[PDB]
Design a protein around this ligand. Structure first.
Ligand SMILES: [Ca+2]
Ligand SMILES: [Ca+2]
Length: 66
């Protein structure tokens, strides 16, 4: 219900979540192996898609307020 979830999932306190981090987030709710969805969603959720999505990018992406 906020952006804190993005940083919360980042146990490494890096403020960035890569494709793996994303797939893991949803994996915590169930078991759904999506190679295509992961790749597409990875670049989609990532503003710059630079290996991982930064906290700032996620915030601005939340709600598609770009
Ligand atoms: Ca992280
Ligand atoms: Ca990034």
């Amino acid at each position: 219900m906020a952006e804190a979830l993005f940083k919360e999932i980042d146990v490494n306190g890096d403020g960035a979540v890569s494709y793996e981090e994303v797939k893991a987030f949803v994996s915590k709710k169930r078991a759904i192996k999506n190679e295509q969805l992961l790749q597409l969603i990875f670049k989609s959720i990532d503003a710059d898609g630079n290996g991982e999505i930064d906290q700032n990018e996620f915030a601005k992406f939340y709600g598609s307020i770009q």
